[PDB]
Specification:
The complex is a heterotrimer. Helices cover about 0% and strands about 50% of the residues of chain B. Chain B is built from no helices and 19 strands. The termini of chain B are far apart. Chain C is mainly β. Chain C folds into 2 domains: about 110 residues, Immunoglobulin-like, CATH 2.60.40.10; about 100 residues, Immunoglobulin-like. The longest helix of chain C is centred in the C-terminal third of the chain and has 6 residues. The chains are: A mainly beta, B mainly beta, C mainly beta. Chains B and C meet through strand 10, strand 12, strand 13, strand 15 and strand 17 of B and strand 5, strand 10, strand 12, strand 13 and strand 16 of C. Chain A: It is found in: Secreted; Cytoplasmic granule lumen; Cytoplasmic vesicle lumen.
Chain lengths: ~170, ~200, ~210
């Protein structure tokens, strides 16, 4: 498995603004060190909603077709744009969990970096989020170049087939 | 070869503001971060803050209120300004760099700048010959630190840590011999440089 | 922040001992740890980056291992020049965070001190000052007592001792003791004694001068 980048090397959306990032995001594409297009091929699209709490944390809710609801708390870390997973002790399979907003323009897209340790294995990925379920090839290509930048290759990149069931909230 | 040099006044009143300049060489500020780490007497190392190649900066949350790190890319200079100083800001202030290629590890350090935060004024040593084999140099009543002592401009000898008595430092240095030499004392702060041949 | 617990705080080592410092991170840092060496007076120089990678310049007797929150640095064969403080560094995220450090001291064979006393200079006496200096050089181990007496009255007040860092040459310590005194109180008394006692010493070592 390809080694995880540091949080200093992974970019950080500057003056990240919790207010504008909140809300519904659709996972247009995902790319990461455990991903295999040749075996996996593609995956049904799912949404992630970032509900800004008065803490300034997020109550992150992912809606998935299968509807299945994956609900977590993202707690702000050392630099705005970074988070850890709230109450990690409740997740047997998780010994480390880092979230970092690499790039976003809040209106259209975001590229967000997820790193973690499960069963003594170091995983990482970046999702291509989009406020709509479709995105520009420039941004799809841009996203590709970004994951290539992190050491990943074409077999590590995957795009979601979109749906209407569950994910529109 | 990659080089960093901290400079600027190495004695600051509690009232006042520290200003250090770091002049880098062997690399560009466009392409590299420069970060300041400090070390109080007999204590560990502390990252204060930094300026990345981008021009953006970050600081130790404990010092964001007081610290300002800027730069001049053309002159290859990175500047630190810290205010509301206190005695406990006395330390060796290191200039430092980290590169993306090495995953932002700290790989180059300046020599460090002694910064003493004191209300006491600068004062040069009086140097006295110490003779009775072992001989010595008595360097008495200077401020602030440090002084460098050498013997016969480098025929090496123990130079002990200075001790503080009534706002002023004293230090001694010995050199041992058989047939039988001059002291070389220097005090940057007071542009003092003395030689003490010890006769008898 | 990520907290870095480095231990041990201090280490005593004989030449050729294997020695291992240890660092535990508050969070997993995905191998983004570095180890520095710092000799007194100089800056820290990097020895190992990314857990186990040696720098050009690092001798092979240095190495590091670990993953997750737990990491270590080992000298396989301690030499004289390995004497220093060692620090670990986390550089996975800001703030950069160093371990408290390990001061590595070298153990060696007993060494009895060479004691020299000096009266004040004629120069100093001119400027109405009078310091009496007693060098206690090249001893090991570090524990030592120096005493001053003036005409047989143990002199405590106006005495200051400072000790040298361990000699990268022979691993001894040396001590300098001064007795600071005005010209006029200096001249009321004649016999000045510097009295040392150490592990190596069967009898007090005493050097003196009559004024």
């Amino acid at each position: 498995l390809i080694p995880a980048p540091s949080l200093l090397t992974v970019p950080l959306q500057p003056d990240f603004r919790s207010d504008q990032f909140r809300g519904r995001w659709y996972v247009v594409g995902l790319a990461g060190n455990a991903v295999q297009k040749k075996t996996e091929g593609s995956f049904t699209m799912y949404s992630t909603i970032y509900e800004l709490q008065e803490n300034n944390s997020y109550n992150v809710t992912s809606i998935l077709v299968r509807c299945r609801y994956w609900i977590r708390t993202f707690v702000p870390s050392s630099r705005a744009g970074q988070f850890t997973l709230g109450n990690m002790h409740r997740y047997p399979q998780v010994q480390s969990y880092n979230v970092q907003v690499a790039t976003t323009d809040y209106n259209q897209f975001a590229m967000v970096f997820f790193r973690k340790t499960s069963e003594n294995k170091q995983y990482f990925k970046i999702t291509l989020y989009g406020r709509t379920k479709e995105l520009s090839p420039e941004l799809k290509e841009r996203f590709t170049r970004f994951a290539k930048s992190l050491g990943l290759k074409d077999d590590n990149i995957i795009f979601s087939v979109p749906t209407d069931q569950c994910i529109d909230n | 070869e990659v080089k960093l040099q901290e400079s600027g006044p190495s004695l600051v009143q509690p009232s006042q503001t520290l200003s250090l300049t770091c002049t880098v060489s062997g690399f560009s500020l466009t392409s590299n971060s420069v970060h300041w780490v400090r070390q109080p007497p007999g204590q560990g190392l502390e990252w204060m803050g930094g300026i990345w190649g981008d021009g953006r900066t970050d600081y130790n949350s404990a010092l964001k209120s007081r610290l300002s790190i800027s730069r001049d890319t053309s002159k290859s200079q990175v500047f630190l300004k810290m205010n509301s100083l206190q005695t406990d800001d006395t330390a060796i202030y290191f200039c430092t760099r980290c590169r993306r290629d090495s995953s932002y590890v700290v790989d180059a350090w300046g020599q460090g700048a002694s910064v003493t935060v004191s209300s006491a004024k600068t004062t040069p040593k009086l140097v006295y010959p110490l003779a009775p084999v072992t001989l010595g140099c008595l360097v008495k009543g200077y401020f602030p630190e440090p002084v460098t002592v050498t013997w016969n401009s480098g025929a090496l000898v123990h130079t002990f840590p200075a001790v503080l008595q009534s706002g002023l430092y004293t230090l001694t240095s010995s050199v041992t011999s058989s047939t039988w030499v001059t002291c070389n004392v220097a005090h940057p702060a007071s542009s003092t440089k003395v030689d003490k041949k010890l006769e008898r | 922040d990520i907290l870095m617990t480095q231990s041990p705080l201090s280490l005593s080592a004989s030449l050729g001992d294997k020695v291992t410092i240890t660092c535990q991170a508050s969070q997993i840092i995905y191998n983004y740890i570095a180890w520095y060496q710092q000799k007194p007076g100089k800056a820290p120089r990097l020895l190992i980056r990314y857990t186990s990678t040696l720098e050009s310049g690092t001798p092979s007797r240095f190495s590091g291992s670990g993953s997750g929150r737990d990491y270590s640095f080992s000298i396989s064969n301690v030499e004289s020049e390995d004497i220093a403080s060692y620090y670990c560094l986390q550089y996975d995220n800001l703030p950069y965070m160093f371990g408290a450090g390990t001061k590595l001291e070298l153990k060696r064979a007993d060494a009895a001190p060479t004691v020299s006393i000096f009266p004040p200079s004629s120069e100093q006496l001119a400027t109405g000052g009078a310091s009496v200096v007693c060098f206690v050089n090249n001893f090991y181990p570090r524990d030592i007592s120096v005493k001053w007496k003036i005409d047989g009255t143990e002199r405590r007040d106006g005495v200051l001792d400072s000790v040298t860092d361990q000699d990268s040459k022979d691993s001894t310590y040396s001590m300098s003791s001064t007795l600071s005194l005005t010209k006029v109180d200096y001249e009321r008394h004649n016999l000045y004694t510097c009295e040392v006692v150490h592990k190596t010493s069967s009898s007090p070592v005493v050097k003196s001068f009559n004024r």
